[PDB]
Design an enzyme around this catalytic site. Sequence first.
Site, PDB file in Angstrom:
ATOM      1  N   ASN A 126       0.819  -1.207   0.000  1.00  0.00           N
ATOM      2  CA  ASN A 126       0.000   0.000   0.000  1.00  0.00           C
ATOM      3  C   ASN A 126       0.855   1.260   0.000  1.00  0.00           C
ATOM      4  OD1 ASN A 126       0.945  -0.036   2.565  1.00  0.00           O
ATOM      5  ND2 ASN A 126      -1.038  -0.453   3.529  1.00  0.00           N
ATOM      6  N   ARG A 183       3.108   7.327  11.079  1.00  0.00           N
ATOM      7  CA  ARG A 183       2.541   6.889  12.344  1.00  0.00           C
ATOM      8  C   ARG A 183       2.317   8.100  13.231  1.00  0.00           C
ATOM      9  NH1 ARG A 183       1.168   2.971   9.889  1.00  0.00           N
ATOM     10  NH2 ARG A 183       1.593   0.787  10.553  1.00  0.00           N
ATOM     11  N   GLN A 223      -4.876   3.989  18.166  1.00  0.00           N
ATOM     12  CA  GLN A 223      -5.974   3.741  17.243  1.00  0.00           C
ATOM     13  C   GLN A 223      -6.824   2.581  17.728  1.00  0.00           C
ATOM     14  OE1 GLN A 223      -3.846   5.439  13.214  1.00  0.00           O
ATOM     15  NE2 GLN A 223      -4.459   3.278  13.305  1.00  0.00           N
ATOM     16  N   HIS A 261      -7.610   6.292  10.008  1.00  0.00           N
ATOM     17  CA  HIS A 261      -6.510   5.568   9.381  1.00  0.00           C
ATOM     18  C   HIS A 261      -7.034   4.664   8.280  1.00  0.00           C
ATOM     19  CE1 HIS A 261      -2.731   2.829   9.759  1.00  0.00           C
ATOM     20  NE2 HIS A 261      -2.811   3.432   8.591  1.00  0.00           N
TER      21      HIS A 261
HETATM   22  N1  NAD Z   1      -1.042   5.487   6.589  1.00  0.00           N
HETATM   23  C1  NAD Z   1      -0.987   4.215   5.979  1.00  0.00           C
HETATM   24  O1  NAD Z   1      -1.976   3.569   5.697  1.00  0.00           O
HETATM   25  C2  NAD Z   1       0.405   3.629   5.771  1.00  0.00           C
HETATM   26  C3  NAD Z   1       0.609   2.721   4.764  1.00  0.00           C
HETATM   27  C4  NAD Z   1       1.863   2.168   4.588  1.00  0.00           C
HETATM   28  C5  NAD Z   1       2.887   2.546   5.482  1.00  0.00           C
HETATM   29  N2  NAD Z   1       2.668   3.448   6.510  1.00  0.00           N
HETATM   30  C6  NAD Z   1       3.731   3.774   7.418  1.00  0.00           C
HETATM   31  O2  NAD Z   1       4.854   4.423   6.608  1.00  0.00           O
HETATM   32  C7  NAD Z   1       6.023   3.891   7.058  1.00  0.00           C
HETATM   33  C8  NAD Z   1       7.046   3.864   5.914  1.00  0.00           C
HETATM   34  O3  NAD Z   1       6.611   2.997   4.862  1.00  0.00           O
HETATM   35  P1  NAD Z   1       7.571   2.669   3.657  1.00  0.00           P
HETATM   36  O4  NAD Z   1       6.885   1.650   2.834  1.00  0.00           O
HETATM   37  O5  NAD Z   1       8.062   3.914   3.016  1.00  0.00           O
HETATM   38  O6  NAD Z   1       8.841   1.995   4.468  1.00  0.00           O
HETATM   39  P2  NAD Z   1      10.342   1.826   4.011  1.00  0.00           P
HETATM   40  O7  NAD Z   1      10.927   0.850   4.999  1.00  0.00           O
HETATM   41  O8  NAD Z   1      10.439   1.532   2.565  1.00  0.00           O
HETATM   42  O9  NAD Z   1      10.988   3.258   4.198  1.00  0.00           O
HETATM   43  C9  NAD Z   1      11.181   3.812   5.495  1.00  0.00           C
HETATM   44  C10 NAD Z   1      12.369   4.816   5.409  1.00  0.00           C
HETATM   45  O10 NAD Z   1      12.385   5.453   6.593  1.00  0.00           O
HETATM   46  C11 NAD Z   1      13.851   5.565   6.981  1.00  0.00           C
HETATM   47  N3  NAD Z   1      13.982   5.953   8.369  1.00  0.00           N
HETATM   48  C12 NAD Z   1      13.978   5.207   9.493  1.00  0.00           C
HETATM   49  N4  NAD Z   1      14.185   5.995  10.557  1.00  0.00           N
HETATM   50  C13 NAD Z   1      14.380   7.243  10.127  1.00  0.00           C
HETATM   51  C14 NAD Z   1      14.667   8.396  10.794  1.00  0.00           C
HETATM   52  N5  NAD Z   1      14.838   8.569  12.162  1.00  0.00           N
HETATM   53  N6  NAD Z   1      14.765   9.502  10.116  1.00  0.00           N
HETATM   54  C15 NAD Z   1      14.636   9.516   8.772  1.00  0.00           C
HETATM   55  N7  NAD Z   1      14.384   8.374   8.088  1.00  0.00           N
HETATM   56  C16 NAD Z   1      14.250   7.229   8.763  1.00  0.00           C
HETATM   57  C17 NAD Z   1      14.315   4.359   6.631  1.00  0.00           C
HETATM   58  O11 NAD Z   1      15.780   4.370   6.508  1.00  0.00           O
HETATM   59  C18 NAD Z   1      13.681   4.060   5.249  1.00  0.00           C
HETATM   60  O12 NAD Z   1      14.432   4.523   4.181  1.00  0.00           O
HETATM   61  C19 NAD Z   1       5.702   2.440   7.492  1.00  0.00           C
HETATM   62  O13 NAD Z   1       6.650   1.911   8.365  1.00  0.00           O
HETATM   63  C20 NAD Z   1       4.308   2.686   8.053  1.00  0.00           C
HETATM   64  O14 NAD Z   1       4.478   3.049   9.490  1.00  0.00           O
HETATM   65  C21 NAD Z   1       1.406   3.988   6.672  1.00  0.00           C
END
Ligand code: NAD
Lengths: 361, 361
Positions: A119, A258, A287, A311
């Site tokens: 997603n 989040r 949530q 959400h």
């Molecule tokens: N709202 C929604 O429905 C929805 C859907 C999908 C994901 N999400 C959330 O989005 C987050 C990210 O998803 P993604 O697919 O891009 O994950 P991903 O793992 O591909 O990318 C996450 C990035 O965040 C970086 N990161 C970690 N800690 C960091 C920090 N302190 N500062 C800066 N960058 C940092 C990581 O190095 C990585 O490159 C998920 O973990 C999830 O919590 C929400």
Amino acid sequence: MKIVLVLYDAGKHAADEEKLYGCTENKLGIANWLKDQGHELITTSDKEGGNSVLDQHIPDADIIITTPFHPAYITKERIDKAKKLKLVVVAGVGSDHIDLDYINQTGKKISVLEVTGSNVVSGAEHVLMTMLVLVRNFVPAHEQIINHDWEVAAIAKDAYDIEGKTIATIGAGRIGYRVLERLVPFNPKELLYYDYQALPKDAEEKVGARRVENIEELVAQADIVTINAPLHAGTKGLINKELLSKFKKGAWLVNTARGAICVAEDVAAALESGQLRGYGGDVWFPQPAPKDHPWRDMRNKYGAGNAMTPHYSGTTLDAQTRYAEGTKNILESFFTGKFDYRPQDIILLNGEYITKAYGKH
Amino acid sequence: MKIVLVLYDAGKHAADEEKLYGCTENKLGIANWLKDQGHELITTSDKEGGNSVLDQHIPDADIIITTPFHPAYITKERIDKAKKLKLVVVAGVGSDHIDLDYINQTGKKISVLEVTGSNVVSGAEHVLMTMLVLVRNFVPAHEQIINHDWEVAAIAKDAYDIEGKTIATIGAGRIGYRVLERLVPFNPKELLYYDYQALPKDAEEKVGARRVENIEELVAQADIVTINAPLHAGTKGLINKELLSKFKKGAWLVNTARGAICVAEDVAAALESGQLRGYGGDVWFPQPAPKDHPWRDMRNKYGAGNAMTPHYSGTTLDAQTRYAEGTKNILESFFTGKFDYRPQDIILLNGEYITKAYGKH
Ligand SMILES: NC(=O)c1ccc[n+]([C@@H]2O[C@H](COP(=O)([O-])OP(=O)(O)OC[C@H]3O[C@@H](n4cnc5c(N)ncnc54)[C@H](O)[C@@H]3O)[C@@H](O)[C@H]2O)c1
Ligand SMILES: NC(=O)c1ccc[n+]([C@@H]2O[C@H](COP(=O)([O-])OP(=O)(O)OC[C@H]3O[C@@H](n4cnc5c(N)ncnc54)[C@H](O)[C@@H]3O)[C@@H](O)[C@H]2O)c1
Ligand SMILES: [Cl-]
Ligand SMILES: [Cl-]
């Protein structure tokens, strides 16, 4: 094996849409397969309180399937009682509702798997949408129409184009990068990112992004900031009063990552004070968000600047079928004993961190 | 010379924002410049009714300056009383509030100039925003939050990603093409356009667009339709009951062009019946939209599918300075007798059509 599946209830809405697989009524559309495979499936949305259905079945569940949109909080206290637990699956993306650090510190042989990529487009679209809604002042504009009013200047006085703005992402992974890709043709002044993981240089060049080495320098120059990192110890409470005071005055902040990456009351106070012109996103802590959570009623000085939703960005109908299939695939990898999980789906393998995106280990 | 300037009133909002050039309080930033040249500037928002301030001054106005967001309807009846009128300027884009055909067909020596390109990015951004808001079901989602509720399935049951959808624009000029450009990185299934002016092949290939030469063929395959043509005899009422019956069932329709390109009641009936899942945009006929205008209260079967706003997308603060400066430039070209207008700004020159975008002549 005994599988406990915690999803949101669709209630009356289940009768409206058969493609709503991600609810308790429909069980990700994998119930026939689990029954034929010989497993026992308990499905519930009752996840809070000492005598919840979740807690009644934790002691002998082999597998718990969760979903971020209605998250079973798999706490230390629950893990200690979960005597048969071998696998927690996330039907979606983001595993922070499980106490990953506790599993890792105790060395408990529990794998945690999520459907990476399922997603990420949905989330990136929601970021773009929320950026445009906030920058262009859409919420009060629509409110005027349905309140039977008409006053162009009341909207225009705080409406801008996204063209020419400097936009920064905190986290440039699957979602953050897809956000940057979608922003390119909007002609931003500049696209910036902060991440301990550098973008591949070809990807950086494709979107014209510039890496900024520290987060204070990043936010100070940004008209728009978007949060696209997972929730872990290094991001919990990251967006707080002190950091918000280093934002550009009147910035717009979008967070579909989040909720707990932000200190809730600090965001609200920054919006009310003008430090932010707007905040929006779909994620909250906890949530379901309580009826009186401060992000519901917070507004800027004009009575706007709030683009909050429940959400759901990662549970659009298009996303649901993808994370349902990915959940099935994870379960099959476990059931066969192959453990041939996709590498990118593995958060913990038997208690060990495999992901690099949840901070350094 | 006597100049009548018809803009919206900002009221108490003018004090909130000095960059609000496009209201009666701030007079496009040209009031002192006009006074220094010896011209008489009448400024008003009073534009309806036989003894409106507009009508009081029409008989000896040399120039009338209008703006689409609060449009002085320069009807044939008014033109017949406008004995000194030589120039109508549009502070914005779209000259359809002037009876251009009457001027042209009866030999009235009146030029009509607009600030082409001044807010085409702004409109295209609004289209993308509205597409996302409708497809992703944002409006009821935000309403749930501010009403202190929480029910993910009530939103997810009609929430989709824009990825994978087929999207069609009616009109592929400055706004329509900019919409297509912004849609590319969203990974639509296909981008389509219908326009009697073909895009250059290079422009088509850049956005991967396919031209469809029959409008019914275009809409029949489109999940999303967007209107981006000017209002003229050829587009007035184009979106009627019969064409809507040929839309893909449950399509989303976005119209930031002009309200009267759609038959208002036909659109509302199509939304209420499910022929459309959603309609949105910022433009209405007439403007200001009456309190009873059917697009205010129309909803789909779920109580959503309405993303209407007042007419403001082309009057963001970034746009207003561009069309204020462009209005000053047009006026200077007139006052000096050079008539060295930018060719793209000329709708009519002394009654003759110069633009090609208002139908064939
Ligand atoms: N709202 C929604 O429905 C929805 C859907 C999908 C994901 N999400 C959330 O989005 C987050 C990210 O998803 P993604 O697919 O891009 O994950 P991903 O793992 O591909 O990318 C996450 C990035 O965040 C970086 N990161 C970690 N800690 C960091 C920090 N302190 N500062 C800066 N960058 C940092 C990581 O190095 C990585 O490159 C998920 O973990 C999830 O919590 C929400
Ligand atoms: N909502 C706003 O604030 C806002 C802002 C700017 C413009 N507009 C409106 O959008 C309209 C278009 O603006 P633009 O800058 O893209 O103009 P443009 O002249 O660059 O493009 C208009 C296109 O429409 C085409 N067209 C004309 N009749 C058509 C028809 N019957 N079917 C299909 N295509 C047709 C033309 O050939 C041309 O390519 C303006 O005329 C105005 O009415 C609204
Ligand atoms: Cl970190
Ligand atoms: Cl035509």
